[PDB]
Amino acid sequence: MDFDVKDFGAKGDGKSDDTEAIQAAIDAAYEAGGGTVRLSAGEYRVSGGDEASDGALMIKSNVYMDGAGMGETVIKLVDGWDQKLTGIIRSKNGEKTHDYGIRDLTLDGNQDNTEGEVDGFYTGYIPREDGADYNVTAERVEIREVSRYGFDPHEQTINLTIRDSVAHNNGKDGFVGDFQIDSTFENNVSHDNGRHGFNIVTSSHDILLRDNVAYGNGANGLVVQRGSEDIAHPYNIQIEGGAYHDNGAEGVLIKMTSNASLQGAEIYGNDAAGVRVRGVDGMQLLDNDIHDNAQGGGKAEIVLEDYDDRDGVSGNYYETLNATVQGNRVAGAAQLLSSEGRDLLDGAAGNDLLDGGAGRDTLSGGGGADTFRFADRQDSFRNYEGDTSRVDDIVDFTPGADLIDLSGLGYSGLGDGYNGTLALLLNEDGTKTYLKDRQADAQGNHFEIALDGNLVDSLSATDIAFDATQLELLGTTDLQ
Numbered sequence: 001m002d003f004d005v006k007d008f009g010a011k012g013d014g015k016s017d018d019t020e021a022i023q024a025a026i027d028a029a030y031e032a033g034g035g036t037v038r039l040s041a042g043e044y045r046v047s048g049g050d051e052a053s054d055g056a057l058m059i060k061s062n063v064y065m066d067g068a069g070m071g072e073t074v075i076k077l078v079d080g081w082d083q084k085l086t087g088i089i090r091s092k093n094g095e096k097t098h099d100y101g102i103r104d105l106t107l108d109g110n111q112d113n114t115e116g117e118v119d120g121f122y123t124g125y126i127p128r129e130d131g132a133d134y135n136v137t138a139e140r141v142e143i144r145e146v147s148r149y150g151f152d153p154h155e156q157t158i159n160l161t162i163r164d165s166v167a168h169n170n171g172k173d174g175f176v177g178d179f180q181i182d183s184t185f186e187n188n189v190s191h192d193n194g195r196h197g198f199n200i201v202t203s204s205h206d207i208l209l210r211d212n213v214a215y216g217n218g219a220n221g222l223v224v225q226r227g228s229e230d231i232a233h234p235y236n237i238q239i240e241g242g243a244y245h246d247n248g249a250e251g252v253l254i255k256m257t258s259n260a261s262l263q264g265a266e267i268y269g270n271d272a273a274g275v276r277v278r279g280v281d282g283m284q285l286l287d288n289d290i291h292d293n294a295q296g297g298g299k300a301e302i303v304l305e306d307y308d309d310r311d312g313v314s315g316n317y318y319e320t321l322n323a324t325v326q327g328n329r330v331a332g333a334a335q336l337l338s339s340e341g342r343d344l345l346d347g348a349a350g351n352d353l354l355d356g357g358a359g360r361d362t363l364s365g366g367g368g369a370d371t372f373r374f375a376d377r378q379d380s381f382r383n384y385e386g387d388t389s390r391v392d393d394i395v396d397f398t399p400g401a402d403l404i405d406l407s408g409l410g411y412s413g414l415g416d417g418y419n420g421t422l423a424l425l426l427n428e429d430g431t432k433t434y435l436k437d438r439q440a441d442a443q444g445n446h447f448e449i450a451l452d453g454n455l456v457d458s459l460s461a462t463d464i465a466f467d468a469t470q471l472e473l474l475g476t477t478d479l480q
């Protein structure tokens with residue numbers, strides 16, 4: 001049943017400290033085995049406790065707080081508070097709080113008239129220990145003017161849902177998902193925050209980020225990252241729809257993550273690249289609308305690169321691996337670099353740079369003048385048995401516009417395929433054109449590239465850069 005706050009002494013007048021009265025309703029709801037704590041319209045002032053871990057209000061299992069709506073019910077920290085406050089509404093440290101939530105209310109951190117790191121909504125059990133909160137809901141909720149973190153569900157929370165909510169004008173990050181498991185952020189807006197719109201961090205996995213919007217933030221619109229410590233990377237991160245635009249850094253940044261997906265998003269107006277991918281094992285970048293990024297300088301709308309943490313906390317080198325980039329509309333250059341394993345990399349209207357590294361890769365440039373780089377003779381080859389797998393294929397090579405970059409391979413030019421030349425051949429059925437080194441190396445391998453289509457007559461020497469000098473003259477991108 002319902003427990004109205006005013007029936008416990010809450011005023012909601014903007015002056016009286018209602019922390020005890022509102023906490024009384026929570027305790028009554030928790031003691032009743034569960035219930036809804038209801039707040040009619042008004043601004044309810046609230047103060048913290050002795051320590052930061054006390055937060056301000058402590059929500060408990062099976063207790064739900066329902067206000068009169070965003071802007072109508074406002075829970076605001078008192079003027080003059082000067083202590084770190086981890087969660088204006090929070091669950092208890094060391095307790096597995098479950099089946100609780102908050103709806104239709106505004107949390108105001110009052111950073112203008114307070115000092116100290118303030119977080120709005122804090123969940124979780126115990127940092128670096130096993131155990132979790134679970135079944136946590138936030139619906140139609142505004143968190144604003146907190147000095148550090150607006151929505152800050154923390155380690156660990158399972159089945160957190162935040163939908164139709166807003167975080168804005170917060171000191172650091174509007175949304176932080178810190179070791180969230182099996183959780184959903186849907187149809188949220190995070191804007192004009194000090195650093196990040198959304199920040200998924202600290203081993204979070206199986207996260208859906210659907211139709212979220214982030215703009216005007218001082219840093220990334222959305223960042224998915226390991227964080228500063230040598231712990232398990234996040235994985236299984238599905239970013240669907242929404243829009244990440246006009247942010248002070250990349251629109252979407254993903255680093256040291258496994259099996260990430262970014263699909264159907266509108267990404268524009270950011271100061272850095274629209275999408276940046278740094279050492280990600282399994283990356284899908286499909287059907288996005290990416291334009292007018294790198295407003296603060298920069299040469300690329302999309303950046304795929306490694307993450308070298310050898311001098312960092314983990315001491316490891318993290319390659320970007322198992323990448324699929326298809327169907328994107330990109331009004332600018334895409335830098336699509338991957339490594340060992342099969343990669344499918346499609347460029348777009350821009351002058352793109354493509355390199356699948358080791359393994360059998362399928363590359364396509366799309367519109368514009370694109371450079372297909374082959375950095376190592378073992379990145380595309382046919383073996384002693386003639387096994388045509390491990391040979392790359394370029395779908396749409398356009399003679400006179402695109403470029404094959406062999407500048408590091410040490411071949412002199414086109415020829416009969418021996419003595420450092422490459423032979424230009426056509427397969428029997430007329431469907432594929434091969435660049436082949438007929439000279440086997442010590443392991444029986446032949447460097448070889450397949451070009452879909454018949455290009456033995458249209459492809460000329462100026463379409464291939466065989467050394468650094470030729471790459472300087474013929475390079476179609478400024479990304480090298």
Ligand SMILES: O=C(O)[C@H]1O[C@@H](O[C@H]2[C@H](O)[C@H](O)[C@H](O[C@H]3[C@H](O)[C@H](O)[C@H](O[C@H]4[C@H](O)[C@H](O)[C@H](O[C@H]5[C@H](O)[C@H](O)[C@H](O)O[C@@H]5C(=O)O)O[C@@H]4C(=O)O)O[C@@H]3C(=O)O)O[C@@H]2C(=O)O)[C@@H](O)[C@@H](O)[C@@H]1O
Nearest residue numbers: 051052053054086093126127154178201202226227228229
């Ligand atoms: O990696 C990056 O790139 C980012 O790193 C960011 O630094 C993060 C850290 O990595 C963590 O995420 C950190 O999480 C904090 C969290 O913000 C809270 O401060 C929390 O505080 C709890 C204490 O750790 C402690 O467990 C405490 O237990 C109490 C208990 O409640 C009770 O009172 C009992 O009687 O006594 C114990 C006690 O030991 O005192 O409860 C606290 C609580 O609030 O629940 O601790 C975690 C933590 O990991 O320590 O937050 C920082 C951060 O600043 O965000 C950051 O640098 C960012 O810029 C980077 O991007």
Ligand SMILES: [Ca+2]
Nearest residue numbers: 091092095124
């Ligand atoms: Ca808890």
Ligand SMILES: [Ca+2]
Nearest residue numbers: 111112114115
């Ligand atoms: Ca202040």
Ligand SMILES: [Ca+2]
Nearest residue numbers: 339341356358
């Ligand atoms: Ca590859």
Ligand SMILES: [Ca+2]
Nearest residue numbers: 347348365367
């Ligand atoms: Ca292109």
Ligand SMILES: [Ca+2]
Nearest residue numbers: 365366367368
């Ligand atoms: Ca092209």
Ligand SMILES: [Ca+2]
Nearest residue numbers: 357358359379
């Ligand atoms: Ca390859």
